[PDB]
Design an enzyme around this catalytic site. Sequence first.
Site, mmCIF file in Angstrom:
data_model
loop_
_atom_site.group_PDB
_atom_site.id
_atom_site.type_symbol
_atom_site.label_atom_id
_atom_site.label_comp_id
_atom_site.label_asym_id
_atom_site.label_seq_id
_atom_site.Cartn_x
_atom_site.Cartn_y
_atom_site.Cartn_z
ATOM 1 C CD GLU B 39 -3.277 -0.621 -0.001
ATOM 2 O OE1 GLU B 39 -4.302 -1.358 -0.004
ATOM 3 O OE2 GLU B 39 -3.179 0.362 -0.808
ATOM 4 C CB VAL B 94 -10.250 10.890 7.154
ATOM 5 C CG1 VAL B 94 -11.683 10.942 6.596
ATOM 6 C CG2 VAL B 94 -10.167 11.840 8.336
ATOM 7 N N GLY B 99 -6.232 12.400 -2.971
ATOM 8 C CA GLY B 99 -6.054 13.226 -4.158
ATOM 9 C C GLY B 99 -6.244 12.523 -5.479
ATOM 10 C CB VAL B 117 -1.362 5.565 3.601
ATOM 11 C CG1 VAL B 117 -1.989 6.934 3.803
ATOM 12 C CG2 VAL B 117 -0.050 5.470 4.361
HETATM 13 N N1 LIG Z 1 4.061 9.058 -1.108
HETATM 14 C C1 LIG Z 1 3.089 9.942 -1.350
HETATM 15 N N2 LIG Z 1 3.409 11.083 -1.993
HETATM 16 C C2 LIG Z 1 2.444 11.992 -2.207
HETATM 17 N N3 LIG Z 1 1.154 11.940 -1.882
HETATM 18 C C3 LIG Z 1 0.866 10.798 -1.245
HETATM 19 C C4 LIG Z 1 1.751 9.772 -0.942
HETATM 20 N N4 LIG Z 1 1.108 8.793 -0.190
HETATM 21 C C5 LIG Z 1 -0.121 9.240 -0.068
HETATM 22 N N5 LIG Z 1 -0.334 10.435 -0.690
HETATM 23 C C6 LIG Z 1 -1.611 11.153 -0.731
HETATM 24 O O1 LIG Z 1 -2.480 10.576 0.232
HETATM 25 C C7 LIG Z 1 -3.730 10.203 -0.397
HETATM 26 C C8 LIG Z 1 -4.321 9.015 0.319
HETATM 27 O O2 LIG Z 1 -3.488 7.854 0.072
HETATM 28 P P1 LIG Z 1 -4.203 6.469 0.413
HETATM 29 O O3 LIG Z 1 -4.891 6.377 1.806
HETATM 30 O O4 LIG Z 1 -3.272 5.404 0.068
HETATM 31 O O5 LIG Z 1 -5.358 6.429 -0.683
HETATM 32 P P2 LIG Z 1 -5.316 6.511 -2.268
HETATM 33 O O6 LIG Z 1 -3.867 6.220 -2.754
HETATM 34 O O7 LIG Z 1 -5.805 7.796 -2.744
HETATM 35 N N6 LIG Z 1 -6.295 5.283 -2.706
HETATM 36 P P3 LIG Z 1 -6.175 3.703 -2.300
HETATM 37 O O8 LIG Z 1 -4.676 3.385 -2.037
HETATM 38 O O9 LIG Z 1 -6.652 2.854 -3.518
HETATM 39 O O10 LIG Z 1 -6.973 3.429 -1.119
HETATM 40 C C9 LIG Z 1 -3.355 9.986 -1.855
HETATM 41 O O11 LIG Z 1 -4.469 10.018 -2.752
HETATM 42 C C10 LIG Z 1 -2.357 11.131 -2.077
HETATM 43 O O12 LIG Z 1 -3.067 12.349 -2.275
HETATM 44 MG MG LIG Z 2 -2.965 4.488 -1.927
#
Ligand SMILES: Nc1ncnc2c1ncn2[C@@H]1O[C@H](COP(=O)(O)OP(=O)(O)NP(=O)(O)O)[C@@H](O)[C@H]1O
Ligand SMILES: [Mg+2]
Lengths: 384, 384
Positions: B39, B94, B99, B117
């Site tokens: 992830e 949350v 993004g 994450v």
């Molecule tokens: N390494 C990173 N660099 C930049 N932005 C990040 C990074 N990790 C997370 N983000 C931001 O954090 C948001 C949430 O990440 P996350 O909870 O993994 O969900 P997601 O990637 O949008 N979808 P999903 O992984 O399918 O559940 C992302 O959509 C990015 O906007």
């Molecule tokens: Mg993700």
Amino acid sequence: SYDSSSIKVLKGLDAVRKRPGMYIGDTDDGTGLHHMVFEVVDNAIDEALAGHCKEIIVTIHADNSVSVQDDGRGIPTGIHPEEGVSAAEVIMTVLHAGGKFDDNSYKVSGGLHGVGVSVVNALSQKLELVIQREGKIHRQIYEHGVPQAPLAVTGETEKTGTMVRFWPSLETFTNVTEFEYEILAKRLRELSFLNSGVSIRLRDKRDGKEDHFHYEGGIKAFVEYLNKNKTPIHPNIFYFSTEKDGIGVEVALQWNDGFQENIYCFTNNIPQRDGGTHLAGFRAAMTRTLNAYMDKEGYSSATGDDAREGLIAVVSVKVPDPKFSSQTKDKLVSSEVKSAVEQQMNELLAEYLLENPTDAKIVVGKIIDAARAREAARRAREMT
Amino acid sequence: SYDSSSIKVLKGLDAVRKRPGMYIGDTDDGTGLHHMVFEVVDNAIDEALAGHCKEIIVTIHADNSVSVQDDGRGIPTGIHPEEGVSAAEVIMTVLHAGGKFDDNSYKVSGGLHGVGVSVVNALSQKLELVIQREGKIHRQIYEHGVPQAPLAVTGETEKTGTMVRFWPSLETFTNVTEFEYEILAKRLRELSFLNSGVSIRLRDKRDGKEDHFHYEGGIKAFVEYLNKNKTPIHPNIFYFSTEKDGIGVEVALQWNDGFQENIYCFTNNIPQRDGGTHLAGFRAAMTRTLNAYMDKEGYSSATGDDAREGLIAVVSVKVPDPKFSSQTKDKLVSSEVKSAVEQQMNELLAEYLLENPTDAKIVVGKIIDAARAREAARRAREMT
Ligand SMILES: Nc1ncnc2c1ncn2[C@@H]1O[C@H](COP(=O)(O)OP(=O)(O)NP(=O)(O)O)[C@@H](O)[C@H]1O
Ligand SMILES: [Mg+2]
Ligand SMILES: Nc1ncnc2c1ncn2[C@@H]1O[C@H](COP(=O)(O)OP(=O)(O)NP(=O)(O)O)[C@@H](O)[C@H]1O
Ligand SMILES: [Cl-]
Ligand SMILES: [Cl-]
Ligand SMILES: [Mg+2]
Ligand code: NA
Ligand code: NA
């Protein structure tokens, strides 16, 4: 520009509409569409597992809606103090909300995520809720998950139950957009076998077709049904039901003279299309127990796959807090269920083979014949 | 008594801890444990897909934590006005926040649910977040998903990137509780093939082991790698990459003289273990195109399974808003991807067979031989 305004939080049921696949599955081939029905039916079955519901009626309406009526306890109607609206509305509009996060209201339930009927609501152009409870009839209408008015009393009743009617949103569902009688009937027939004493009716108002499922005999009878148009090779269906170490395990099986394997696995009456730890435990005990028997009786080197050919089995487990990989619950990922099934099967299948020598001899013959055919296929392949 | 007080609403990340299976998968066999890493890695790969990250470092630490560092844009740090805390904290605490709900920050991304994450955080005894952005270093610590202090500036930097280190909670994960180098390396090697120009490093501080993956040649080279210790039967790997109708489709394949089929499917660089609509479209075009060729050249009745034997293929699609059945994204359920892959394959595979007559003749020979072996196995079975 990537900054804090680029980060969005989806509220209420917006996440469901945005990403329906993680909640309902495939929205184009019909499987997601019918899953909407099965979520509502699963909640009625949970009232039946709890001892409170004796009749379920599923109706396909002529306007392509489906309704499910049960005669259970009714979705609670009192105001939920924290949220300030009726508990029913919290249930319909909030993810991870419900009465199955402990075992006080439902000892055992197919439900566990607090998501199912909120998904149905979110993905329905319209939903009608009617609840019979505490001498009163309560009603509420939703459109795209949005309540039109607060839950209201509309009259009096001696009865208890919940009725949900929904019209699926074509902004979400594509291609297969009409309900297929036989998809629903298959699942409802199997639920009748799994829930003796519960009357399940299916009615199609498009064409007047109806069914009433009320089989007795449970999963042993389910195995008979599944071999109906086949030819069982031994007369005595293996069956047990036990409850040990917090876990219910119920198994029935019988071999036929065909060459396919059909094992049906269920956890709290929800099928696992993609198997899981219960199936892994079933296979492990079958392989062990048959090999032990063939060794003790002097018939033995077949493998676990030769035990497959001609098999029909049903494995049904009842588990306080099971673990599934998804909202659709296609696969059971609970390690302690593997051990409960394996252990119960090893003990009771060995007794079965001792108590039914004629069946045991026939089944050994079948396993040996499967192995002989497998080895001949292999040699033939090698030689081309 | 079943009433409105029986209805519970799970807040924040409590749902994840309560029902980890729907978020992370199997918490006992190791697959969920390693998914926590993937992830975090998927989020760095998404920065690489967007053009902003050229190096990823994955470290297995001696205390059984894992860290992932990327040199991308950095998780936004500015205050999120609606929630009133840093966008990074909203992201970590949350569900359904991020993004990737539009295409402004990431044109194409493996991410889409806004959950990943936040799941890692919820299921970690501790998580350390370090963000390099706008000339500044930002840091925050979480324990069981709970921030210890608000995100804080700790210094200055010329660099941009995100570093996440997490220690998985043993209140959630059981049995397989240590990270396995080779599980991580397999996935990271494949991501190097899928992301040319991106340096991926893996370091194990338990034993000093390390890898640096930076393959060139992309998925065509990936197919070479996968046939390395096998024997390809024709020299020219079939390959194309196209972008038509909003959808990127990239395929490479080659037959070997063995008898297994290994097709690897990916959507925005995330593997689908359980296939989906991209695999269905690939199979459909292969069957059609080969049958057409055998008919036109006068070699024809084989089926789709005879095309399987000896095949290695990689199918990689790039899709604005794909649909998966689960957070783990084991299966792609997007109907328009079936059509894009099918259409592109039919056109380009037919050209390949015309442009490479020697390879075409060898592949036809192999298909015919597979069919001959299948029919001999069948006759042999029947006769026992
Ligand atoms: N390494 C990173 N660099 C930049 N932005 C990040 C990074 N990790 C997370 N983000 C931001 O954090 C948001 C949430 O990440 P996350 O909870 O993994 O969900 P997601 O990637 O949008 N979808 P999903 O992984 O399918 O559940 C992302 O959509 C990015 O906007
Ligand atoms: Mg993700
Ligand atoms: N027919 C019904 N009769 C009584 N209570 C019901 C009925 N349907 C729903 N409920 C209540 O509404 C809650 C939420 O249902 P639902 O959204 O389906 O989630 P869940 O059944 O708890 N879990 P899941 O289906 O696995 O997501 C249940 O837990 C019950 O408390
Ligand atoms: Cl910002
Ligand atoms: Cl109440
Ligand atoms: Mg439910
Ligand atoms: Na429960
Ligand atoms: Na997006």
